[PDB]
Amino acid sequence: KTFTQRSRLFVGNLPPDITEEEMRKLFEKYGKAGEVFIHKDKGFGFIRLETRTLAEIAKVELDNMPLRGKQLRVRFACHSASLTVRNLPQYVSNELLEEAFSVFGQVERAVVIVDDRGRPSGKGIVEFSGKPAARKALDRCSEGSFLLTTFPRPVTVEPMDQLDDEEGLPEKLVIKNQQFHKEREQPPRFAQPGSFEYEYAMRWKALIEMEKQQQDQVDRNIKEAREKLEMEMEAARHEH
Amino acid sequence: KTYTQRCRLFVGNLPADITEDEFKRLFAKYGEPGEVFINKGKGFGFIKLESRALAEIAKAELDDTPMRGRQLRVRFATHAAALSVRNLSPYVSNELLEEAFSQFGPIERAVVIVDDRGRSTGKGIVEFASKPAARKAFERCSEGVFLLTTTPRPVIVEPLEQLDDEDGLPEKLAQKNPMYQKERETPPRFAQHGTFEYEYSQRWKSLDEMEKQQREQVEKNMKDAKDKLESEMEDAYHEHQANLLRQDLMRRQEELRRMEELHNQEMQKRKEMQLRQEEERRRREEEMMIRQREMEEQM
Secondary structure, three states, X not given: OOOOHHHEEEEEOOOOOOOHHHXXXXXXXXXXXXXXXXXXXXXXXXXXXXXXXHHHHHHHHHOOOEEOOEEOEXXXXXXXXXXXXXXXXXXXXXXXXXHHHOOOOOEEEEEEEEXXXXXEEEEEEEEEOOHHHHHHHHHHHHHOOEEOOOOOOOOEEEEOOOOEOOOOOOOOOOOOOHHHHHHOOOOOOEOOOOOHHHHHHHHHHHHHHHHHHHHHHHHHHHHHHHHHHHHHHHHHOOOO | OOOOXXXXXXXXXXXXXXXXXXXXXXXXXXXXXXXXXXXXXXXXEEEEOOOHHHHHHHHHHHOOOEEOOEEOEEEEOOOOOEEEEEOOOOOOOHHHHHHHHHOOOOEEEEEEEEOOOOOEEEEEEEEEOOXXXXXXXXXXXXXXXXXXXXXXXXXXXXEOOOOEOOOOOOHHHHOOOHHHHHHOOOOOEEOOOOOHHHHHHHHHXXXXXXXXXXXXXXXXXXXXXXXXXXHHHOOOOOOHHHHHHHHHHHHHHHHHHHHHHHHHHHHHHHHHHHHHHHHHHHHHHHHHHHHHHHHHOOO
């Protein structure tokens, strides 16, 4: 597919005298330009390039480029119509997900997330070209029971939990309040055995072990109930 | 920092018939090649470039480009020396997390993962130059109790779970299991009412809800058990700040008693000499009163 949201770039620190035409000139090197949005007063905008390949190149070549006083901030736009799908079947493909969710409208891209051993995590990603399509899908899959394969256990569609592991939380953006300063007095140190803090922070290191042993009981609880429910259903299908 | 594990590209679908210099020509335009490894049998290799950006352009420019009959597969190689770190304060910064984890070896990269509004999630990634530097940081923080703030929240260091959300699980790979094409016999659909599957759809929704109900039950468990540890360790702190005021005040009383007994010693030496003056004054009077008697009865 071409002119997907995945070739859509946010551009920041633009000068106030920016025109729809100069932003097209700036990106002239990267072929055909689709939709352009600009707010001159705020000095940010959106440019949608032909392919992800050209947006990946444009991003790197133009991020931190100087322009009339400031250095440009070029990023990939956050997807506006991305869903997380949970409770995926045991046997599932990128292609099945795209086909399944194309019922609600244009799907730009669908992915079954896999571990390094190549097995699915149980999560997947569905990215629609438009927000309405994502809205229908999200709503209809909440009220309805959406089934990709024969096995009659339905998919769970959530809005995408969009996280950042690129920029993170830099010191400059951390808020400088009273609690900040109080927290930021004692430096990073290995707590020495026998001190106030050591047997305090030996309770934490147990609270997380039990929380994980609780989260592993929920695992066993729901596995056993899953197993039980499969059997009841096997049998109930034999009632012709 | 140049030629890091973040600058390292993977290249798959290489011909078995390649040289290390044929493979190095491929990335000529992107400057001096660093670390290079090839595995001719499995038709794949690794290259390191100076910067993360050079790698990003190179990946972009060379992925799905022909190499004498084969379409290349260029991805970023999975960081083999990367760590997950959770249970961080919302003030732990990328810079601080780095500073803190610098104590274990050379830090390629340290980020705290932020949500859509830039707030910290209490999870973050630490990438070390060497496997050793990570193993050190893991073994030490798993045994020891590494803190990063005033508040004694320990950091939880696990190995990083690297999930592929790019290539995912394509159909051609899914077809390898015969259970795939079987399950796909029914097409994607909404369970219509009156069908026997509709019933069991809703019984699966019941189990999914029970899972999400029981897992939020664990979140409550944690949240109420830490608020029990906040008051249980803050009252063993006002017992330790009382045992400080108890000892400190008993030292100021013992030293007071001392210096008050010195002020007494001094008073008794003043009283001692002022007595001995008055003892002579009255001694001399007696001698001179009685010596006068002795000169009168001599005449």
